[PDB]
Amino acid sequence: ENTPLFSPSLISPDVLAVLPADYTIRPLCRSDYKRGYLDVLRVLTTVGDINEEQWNSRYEWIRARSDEYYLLVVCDGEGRIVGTGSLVVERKFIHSLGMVGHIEDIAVEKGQQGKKLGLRIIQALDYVAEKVGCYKTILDCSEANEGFYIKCGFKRAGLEMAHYY
Amino acid sequence: ENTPLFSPSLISPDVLAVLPADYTIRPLCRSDYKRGYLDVLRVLTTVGDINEEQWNSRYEWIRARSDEYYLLVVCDGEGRIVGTGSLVVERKFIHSLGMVGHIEDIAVEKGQQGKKLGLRIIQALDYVAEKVGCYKTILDCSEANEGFYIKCGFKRAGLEMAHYY
Numbered sequence: 378e379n380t381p382l383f384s385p386s387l388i389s390p391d392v393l394a395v396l397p398a399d400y401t402i403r404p405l406c407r408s409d410y411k412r413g414y415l416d417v418l419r420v421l422t423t424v425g426d427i428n429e430e431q432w433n434s435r436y437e438w439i440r441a442r443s444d445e446y447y448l449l450v451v452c453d454g455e456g457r458i459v460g461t462g463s464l465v466v467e468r469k470f471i472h473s474l475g476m477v478g479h480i481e482d483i484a485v486e487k488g489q490q491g492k493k494l495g496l497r498i499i500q501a502l503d504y505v506a507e508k509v510g511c512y513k514t515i516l517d518c519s520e521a522n523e524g525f526y527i528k529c530g531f532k533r534a535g536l537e538m539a540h541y542y
Numbered sequence: 543e544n545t546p547l548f549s550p551s552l553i554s555p556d557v558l559a560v561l562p563a564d565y566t567i568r569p570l571c572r573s574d575y576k577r578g579y580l581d582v583l584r585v586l587t588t589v590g591d592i593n594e595e596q597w598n599s600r601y602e603w604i605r606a607r608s609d610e611y612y613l614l615v616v617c618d619g620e621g622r623i624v625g626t627g628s629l630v631v632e633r634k635f636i637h638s639l640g641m642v643g644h645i646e647d648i649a650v651e652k653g654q655q656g657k658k659l660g661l662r663i664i665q666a667l668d669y670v671a672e673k674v675g676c677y678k679t680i681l682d683c684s685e686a687n688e689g690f691y692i693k694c695g696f697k698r699a700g701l702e703m704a705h706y707y
């Protein structure tokens with residue numbers, strides 16, 4: 378239930394050193410359903426009603442793929458989840474069988490925003506991607522939050538195109 | 543060796559119906575190393591020297607994940623690979639445990655460009671993503687080829703940001 382989704386060794390030591398006092402950044406675990414996890418994702422977009430059995434099923438799917446999916450959380454001093462971020466590592470044939478990190482689903486609870494937690498999440502995900510051998514990490518953002526990603530050390534690389542069903 | 547990476551049933555019947563005569567669109571198979579596959583990817587970006595043992599290893603990795611990675615090719619009337627495209631299906635918690643299709647590594651050999659093959663590749667990948675239950679498909683492009691993606695029925699959705707290592 379409390380077993381980390383991936384090795385705690387993958388959490389950037391430099392990030393841990395600079396986090397506000399008593400806050401923590403760590404891999405997701407299964408019991409995080411019960412600690413406010415989904416409620417954090419709701420600041421970002423539509424989540425829907427998900428029951429515990431559904432959470433468990435999808436968590437186990439991700440856990441079986443913990444060499445691809447790296448989901449982590451920021452917890453406050455009371456152990457509540459207040460921030461989320463994901464990295465998905467894509468395998469390619471190009472770049473000599475390279476790998477590309479994709480940052481996804483970045484969210485910080487409204488009352489906890491503007492305190493560098495989002496920056497620390499991005500820094501942690503970048504550390505994972507580099508460490509496992511990705512040649513780059515990419516993500517998509519809006520015009521309204523491009524400046525956040527700039528402050529995280531990302532640079533504009535192209536355009537996101539979409540087809541919704 | 544010739545076993546398709548994923549079910550031929552996932553190849554859009556409407557796309558097959560409109561492809562130029564004798565051309566085919568079909569899943570990757572292992573023996574495609576020997577049919578010009580990597581040489582097509584070279585129009586898109588850096589590929590590097592990859593030997594057959596390396597190809598086989600990475601192919602098997604992808605094949606073990608054929609519910610995530612959908613790589614397909616266009617072959618000309620002589621069975622040479624002249625086009626490539628990939629779809630990677632990401633699992634989420636948001637959108638009621640939704641899935642997002644990601645189009646990647648789109649390439650058509652120089653002498654075969656401007657004949658709707660790229661359009662057919664995109665159409666085929668969109669069909670896979672919808673059929674397996676994705677709520678949308680996204681991709682990143684440059685300003686210079688945005689117009690191609692527009693002609694494929696994609697619309698601008700945001701900005702691609704990157705951090706290279």
Ligand SMILES: CC(=O)N[C@@H]1[C@@H](O)[C@H](O)[C@@H](COP(=O)(O)O)O[C@@H]1O
Nearest residue numbers: 422423480481482483516517518642
């Ligand atoms: C860096 C980051 O947080 N990117 C996310 C992406 O991960 C998520 O899939 C999407 C959901 O938006 P949607 O509900 O309209 O698909 O929003 C943003 O693009």
Ligand SMILES: CC(=O)N[C@@H]1[C@@H](O)[C@H](O)[C@@H](COP(=O)(O)O)O[C@@H]1O
Nearest residue numbers: 477587588645646647648681682683
């Ligand atoms: C739609 C499409 O074809 N997208 C590709 C992407 O799949 C690939 O990973 C990248 C490689 O570029 P890079 O060599 O600079 O990483 O180019 C384009 O963004």
